[PDB]
C-alpha cells in the first residue's frame, strides 16, 4: 500500500560496482519473485532493466544484475558506467492486478576528468528591447563536475535581482549544462557601463561581459 | 515494433477532471493491461491501477480508488483514464505502461511518453520568441554560439528544433526557468562555422502544443 522503500542516492566512481536496495513487505517482495527494476534518465519514461527478480531484458548490459533475499531485492550495477547516471526505481507485484513502486534511488558516477565550462553570454536582442524588455542570458556547458555558482554584476557591483539560474542539467556528452537569466528594464540596460555573468567551477571563476555600445 | 502513444500536456483548473489516453499500435491483441503510473515534479513513480480490455477488468491502488476510472476500447487498442477533482497535488506526469500478458508477465516492457498534467488557475500562454545573435567571430569556423530565448510560456512543455531538422547536432536547449511569475522560459543554442553566418540563414522553430502555437524565428547578425 505504501511505497518500497529505497536509498535515495548512491554514488561510485568509473569501473566500481553498487547497489541499490529496495524493501517491501512480506506481502509483495517477499511472496513474489516478481520483482523489476526501471532505469529513468532526467526527461524521459522509465525504461525495464531487471524484471523477475535476475533476469535481464535483451540489449541490457550484463553489467546490472537482480537480487532478492526475505522482503529486500538489490540492484546490482558492476563496472559503472557515466551513461547510467540516473533514477532507478524498484517494482514489486502486489497481488492480483496490483504494483507497488519504490521511492527511487539517484546513481551519480563520480571521478570523471575534469572538464572547464564554456561560458557565452548574450545581450538583450533589440527586438526584446522594441518589446520594452531587456533579458541578459549566460549559458554554461560542457563541465564536470556537474555543479555551478553564478554571479552578476553592474558594472562591478553584485546583483541579485531579477536573477534565475536553473539547476544543472546532463548533456549527451556526460557533461553538464546549465543557464541563468538577468532580467532588466531597458532603461537599467542602457544606463550602466557593462554588465557581467560570472561562473564559478571548483573555486575556478570566470566571466564574461557585455556592454551597452 | 510496439508503441504506447498518448495524449499531450493539459492545464486543468482545480475541480476539473482530466482525461488523459494511451493508444497502442503493433501490440497482439489478447490479455494484455495497461497501467497508469504518475509522477509528481521531482517524485518516484506511483502506480494508479490498470485495466485489462479483453476482460473488461479494472483495479486500482487505495489512494486513487473513487478518483480514478480506467476504460478502454480494445477495437482500438486504446486505454482512458479519467481523474476528477483536480488540485494541485494531481500535476504529475502521467504514463501509460503495458504488461503483454497478464497471466505470464508480471512487469512493465512498454512505457507511453507521459502526458504532464499541470493544475493551476493560471492561464494557457504561448511563447514569445527573440534571437540571440552571434555578433562575434573567432576564424573561418572557431567559435560561434547563436540561438533563440522562448519567453513567458504556460505550461509546460516546449520544444525547439533548427530549420526544421536540417540543423541537428551541435544544438543544446536547455531546460526551462520558473519565473516568479509562474511562466517558464528557456534558451536553445546552436554552434556553426563563422563563415556559416554569411550564408546560411538560421531559423529556430518552437512548438508550444498545449497553447497549439508554432513559431518560426530567424536569427541574423
Known amino acids: 500500500q505504501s511505497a518500497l522503500t529505497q536509498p535515495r542516492s548512491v554514488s561510485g566512481s568509473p569501473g566500481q560496482s553498487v547497489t541499490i536496495s529496495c524493501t517491501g513487505t512480506?506481502?509483495?517482495?517477499?511472496?513474489?519473485?516478481?520483482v523489476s527494476w526501471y532505469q529513468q534518465l532526467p526527461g524521459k519514461a522509465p525504461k525495464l532493466m531487471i524484471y523477475?527478480?535476475?533476469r535481464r531484458p535483451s540489449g541490457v548490459p550484463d553489467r546490472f544484475s537482480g537480487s532478492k533475499s526475505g522482503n529486500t531485492a538489490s540492484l546490482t550495477i558492476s563496472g559503472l558506467q557515466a551513461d547510467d547516471e540516473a533514477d532507478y526505481y524498484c517494482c514489486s507485484y502486489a497481488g492480483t492486478l496490483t504494483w507497488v513502486f519504490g521511492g527511487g534511488t539517484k546513481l551519480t558516477v563520480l571521478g570523471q576528468p575534469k572538464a572547464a565550462p564554456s561560458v557565452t553570454l548574450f545581450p538583450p536582442s533589440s527586438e526584446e528591447l522594441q518589446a520594452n524588455k531587456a533579458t541578459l542570458v549566460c549559458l554554461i556547458s560542457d563541465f564536470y563536475p556537474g555543479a555551478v555558482t553564478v554571479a552578476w554584476k553592474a558594472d562591478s557591483s553584485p546583483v541579485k535581482a531579477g536573477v534565475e539560474t536553473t539547476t544543472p542539467s546532463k548533456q549527451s556528452n556526460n557533461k553538464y549544462a546549465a543557464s541563468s537569466y538577468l532580467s532588466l528594464t531597458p532603461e537599467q540596460w542602457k544606463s550602466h557601463r557593462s554588465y557581467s555573468c560570472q561562473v564559478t567551477h571548483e573555486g575556478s571563476t570566470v566571466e564574461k561581459t557585455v556592454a551597452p555600445t | 515494433q510496439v508503441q504506447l502513444v498518448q495524449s499531450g500536456a493539459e492545464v486543468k483548473k482545480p475541480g476539473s477532471s482530466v482525461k488523459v489516453s494511451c493508444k497502442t499500435s503493433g501490440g497482439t491483441y489478447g490479455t494484455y493491461s495497461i497501467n497508469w503510473v504518475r509522477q509528481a515534479p521531482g517524485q518516484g513513480l506511483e502506480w494508479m491501477g490498470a485495466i485489462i480490455p479483453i476482460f473488461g477488468k479494472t483495479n486500482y491502488a487505495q489512494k486513487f480508488q473513487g478518483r480514478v476510472t480506467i476504460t478502454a476500447d480494445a477495437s482500438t487498442s486504446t486505454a482512458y483514464m479519467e481523474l476528477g477533482s483536480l488540485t494541485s497535488e494531481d500535476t504529475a506526469m502521467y504514463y501509460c505502461a503495458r504488461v503483454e500478458d497478464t497471466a505470464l508477465d508480471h512487469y512493465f516492457d512498454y512505457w507511453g511518453q507521459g502526458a504532464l498534467v499541470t493544475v493551476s488557475s493560471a492561464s494557457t500562454k504561448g511563447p514569445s520568441v527573440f534571437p540571440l545573435a552571434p555578433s562575434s567571430k573567432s576564424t573561418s569556423g572557431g567559435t560561434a554560439a547563436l540561438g533563440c530565448l522562448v519567453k513567458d510560456y504556460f505550461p509546460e512543455p516546449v520544444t525547439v528544433s533548427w530549420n526544421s531538422g536540417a540543423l541537428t547536432s551541435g544544438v543544446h536547449t536547455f531546460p526551462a526557468v520558473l519565473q516568479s511569475s509562474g511562466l517558464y522560459s528557456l534558451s536553445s543554442v546552436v554552434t556553426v562555422p563563422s563563415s556559416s553566418l554569411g550564408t546560411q540563414t538560421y531559423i529556430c522553430n518552437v512548438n508550444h502544443k498545449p497553447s497549439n502555437t508554432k513559431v518560426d524565428k530567424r536569427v541574423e547578425p
Open positions: 523477475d527478480v535476475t
Open positions: 512480506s506481502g509483495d517482495v517477499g511472496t513474489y519473485n516478481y
